[PDB]
């Protein structure tokens, strides 16, 4: 159930100064490589400890392809200006997502190739890897252009070929690393509010990956009734945090339990307010 994606962005800025091009690679949703045109000496850079293995040749090759991509976005960016009737001196964004997913068997399960402009779907390659799904009128020009040139075939080759060969490779190099986990460490905090009623908040900190489940219960019953839940957030050190809470009637506090479910725990966690 692995995958590899390259998220590319090109943003034009006021003036005749070429746009900034940023390209980021992922394996199983983890950033492993990165390139930025703004940097001092622009080169592709390692972003996961297991990528330092690749010798000079690899980084050189990747750096070139990226310089080509940057030019490709420069050109494409001008054409869009026309498609939409935009003056040559504004702020624009062109994005691309490409990659492949491997199934249980490690065979290509699906390939991806999409673009967005100004934050919206523009044109995407279909699962068949031969037909396109343009999002609007403007995008039709491009779709017609790409059909009338077999542009789809070009991507198909990459998606079923190199994409798969290199994902297998990266998976081999960063095997155990990628498949790691850090269990969350939980604790409950008490906070006042309403006359009588009070708030109990269950915290989950230091866990990886970000997937986690926080539940509150009253007398063994899933209290999915009015529970505060923040979006999971990065702590900064590479781990995550998330918390859920509920408003409870004072005194009847120790009548509630928090349960934490995470892929890294030997067994789920249960904890209650501890004055």
């Amino acid at each position: 159930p692995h995958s590899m994606r390259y998220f590319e962005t090109a943003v034009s800025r006021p003036g005749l100064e070429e746009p900034r091009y940023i390209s980021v690679g992922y394996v199983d949703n983890k950033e492993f490589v990165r390139f930025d045109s703004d940097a001092e000496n622009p080169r592709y850079e390692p972003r996961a400890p297991w990528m330092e293995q690749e010798g000079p040749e690899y980084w050189e090759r990747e750096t070139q392809k990226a310089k080509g991509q940057e030019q490709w976005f420069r050109v494409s960016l001008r054409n869009l200006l026309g498609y939409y009737n935009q003056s040559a001196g504004g702020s624009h964004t062109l994005q691309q997502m490409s990659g492949c997913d491997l199934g249980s068997d490690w065979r290509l399960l699906r390939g991806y190739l999409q673009f967005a402009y100004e934050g919206r779907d523009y044109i995407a390659l279909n699962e068949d890897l031969k037909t396109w799904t343009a999002a609007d009128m403007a995008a039709q020009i491009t779709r017609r252009k790409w059909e009338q040139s077999g542009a789809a075939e070009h991507y198909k080759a990459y998606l079923e070929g190199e994409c798969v060969e290199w994902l297998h490779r990266y998976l081999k190099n960063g095997n155990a690393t990628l498949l790691r986990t850090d269990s969350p460490k939980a604790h409950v905090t008490h906070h006042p509010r309403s006359k009588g009623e009070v708030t109990l908040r269950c915290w989950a900190l230091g866990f990886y990956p970000a997937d986690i489940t926080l539940t509150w219960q009253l007398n063994g019953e899933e209290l999915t009734q009015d529970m505060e839940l923040v979006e999971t957030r990065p702590a900064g050190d590479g781990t995550f945090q998330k918390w859920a809470s509920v408003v409870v009637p004072l005194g009847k506090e120790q009548n509630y339990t928090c349960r934490v479910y995470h892929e890294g725990l030997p067994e789920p966690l249960t904890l209650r307010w501890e004055p």
Binding site: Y6, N79, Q96, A151, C163
Partner: peptide, 9 residues
């Protein structure tokens, strides 16, 4: 492995 785009949009 950075993919290299085909025809421009």
């Amino acid at each position: 492995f950075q993919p290299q785009n085909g025809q421009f949009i």
